[PDB]
Amino acid sequence: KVFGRCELAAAMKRHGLDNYRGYSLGNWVCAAKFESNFNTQATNRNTDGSTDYGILQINSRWWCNDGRTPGSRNLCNIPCSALLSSDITASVNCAKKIVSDGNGMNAWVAWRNRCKGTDVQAWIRGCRL
């Protein structure tokens, strides 16, 4: 599913990401924009053999099982395919664990490089939320 921007904002809000670990909704929308372009089906292989999955590009070395990543820890206790669903529940639940891991949203390199320090509330402008 390719979400619209306000569509995704409403879904993330419904699932409790607005202000989660102190990150306002616009941070999470911005992160999804630059991780996946709001596409839940996005996948990208990494150099270490892991793959990133879904709207927030969550990685198979630590977080989900894809059956082909050695040293996999599966800390979210989910198959990585669950992160590609049109239903963002699994992605949100796992993102909540990731952002709680100690480095906050710096865990998402696209957030650090394209969102952090910017006017992230622009990502929710116009939306009825």
From Swiss-Prot:
Organism listed in the record: Gallus gallus (Chicken)
Q: Could you share any additional remarks the record makes about this protein?
A: Lysozyme C is capable of both hydrolysis and transglycosylation; it also shows a slight esterase activity. It acts rapidly on both peptide-substituted and unsubstituted peptidoglycan, and slowly on chitin oligosaccharides.
Its Gene Ontology molecular function terms? Answer: beta-N-acetylglucosaminidase activity; identical protein binding; lysozyme activity
On tissue specificity, the annotation reads:
In the egg white and polymorphonuclear leukocytes.
| Active-site residue list | E35, D52
Quaternary structure note: Monomer.
Q: State what protein this is by name.
A: Lysozyme C
Which cysteine pairs make disulfide bonds? C6-C127, C30-C115, C64-C80, C76-C94
